[PDB]
Amino acid sequence: PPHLLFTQLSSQYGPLFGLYAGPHLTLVVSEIGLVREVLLQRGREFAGRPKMVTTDLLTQGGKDIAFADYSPLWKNHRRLVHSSFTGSNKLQTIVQEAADSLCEELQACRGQSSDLSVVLMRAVTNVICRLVFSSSSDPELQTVIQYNDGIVQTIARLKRLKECVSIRDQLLYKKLLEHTPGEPRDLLDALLIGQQRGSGGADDITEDHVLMTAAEAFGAGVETTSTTLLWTIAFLLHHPQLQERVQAELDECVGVDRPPCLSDRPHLPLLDAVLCEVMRIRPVSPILIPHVAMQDTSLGGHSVPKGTRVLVNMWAIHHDPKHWDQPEQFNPERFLEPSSFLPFGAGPRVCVGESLARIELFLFVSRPLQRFSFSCPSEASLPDLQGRFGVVLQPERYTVTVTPRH
Ligand code: HEM
Ligand SMILES: C[C@]12CC[C@H](O)CC1=CC[C@@H]1[C@@H]2CC[C@]2(C)C(c3cccnc3)=CC[C@@H]12
């Protein structure tokens, strides 16, 4: 796989490669210094994204955030979303009530070598359809899960894809249509408020961008977080001792009861370190979304023509033995104290869900670990740590035994 291939080649040929496709050049960047040039130092010049056709379909031809070109239209559009992610004092609430749902379904499978994934998909999807449309067991969804899995699978291996996006677009359009500038209840509310306001176009966002942003916040919110929960628990199975310590940390500073609040984070540094280790050892995107050069620029000491694509090899920088000790190995300790670590990227294209992901990961990893304990079953393996990329780096299915405290 690309991220392993260019990681291996970096030791002996440079940390910087070039590939040619048509008449457009692609640089691969696999050294911390050079990625900070791309993402920080000269962040703005590399802030373009490419116009593929699969992404077009996904986002109605660059009407989202992640696959849209940097532009005044994009900067105001991002501002709106950012504001918005920020209150959400909210959740907490939203998260904790889904964590209770999740957590109360897990005990219903006590001593069951369940296969936790359907359960986590439903949990995170609740948090998200909720935080975006205030939507809610059930369901139409299968439908959501059904259309999400259809899109992911189509891309994993169209034709089949359009129809799947079309399902999502109509469904979302209905909730967009149905959707108080004082006290917003939804991320979609916030987006319509800001769209309302702007006299733009030309530069203010059409509402389509709302539909697309709402559609993207799903994809991103569910697929990144699901995976990070699946990875987290996978690792805590190969390392039971560490599972105990985090539980011991949780015991000592939160009760055996108090739903861990967001105000407990400074007091729970080993847990935060575990989330940061999970982020490090399995990048959700071992290669970022291509950054495109918005003008003639440079990198290393070399001119980079405008239109050049730049793949950031985040696996390489997070596994670089020059900046990490035994990066293959799993130590949240390596973060125990208070160069190369950018789990959400950096600069103008940094993750927009970073605030949310930190908060959302904390609140129901603390809680599953507060009420439950996760073990490799007797007649199963340990989970396979290699994992598979598309559309994020996720682990293969694994089976896990849950048992509560008492
Ligand atoms: C859970 C762990 C997550 C990690 C580690 C992560 C990491 C990243 C990274 C590395 C980037 C790209 C940086 C770049 O291209 O320059 C990114 C982009 C993005 N992430 Fe995340 N992300 C996570 C979760 C989420 C969530 C939950 C959302 C929900 C909305 C989200 C939305 C986005 C979006 C919209 C972008 C595109 C940013 C842009 O083009 O400016 N991410 N993320
Ligand atoms: C393809 C998918 C997931 C499947 C959806 O059906 C369509 C979709 C829309 C936006 C994509 C998302 C997966 C993760 C993506 C690719 C990304 C992301 C990836 C990792 C971390 N943060 C953000 C932001 C846009 C996100």
Ligand SMILES: [Hg+2]
């Ligand atoms: Hg489908």
Ligand SMILES: [Hg+2]
């Ligand atoms: Hg505490």
Ligand SMILES: [Hg+2]
């Ligand atoms: Hg096992």
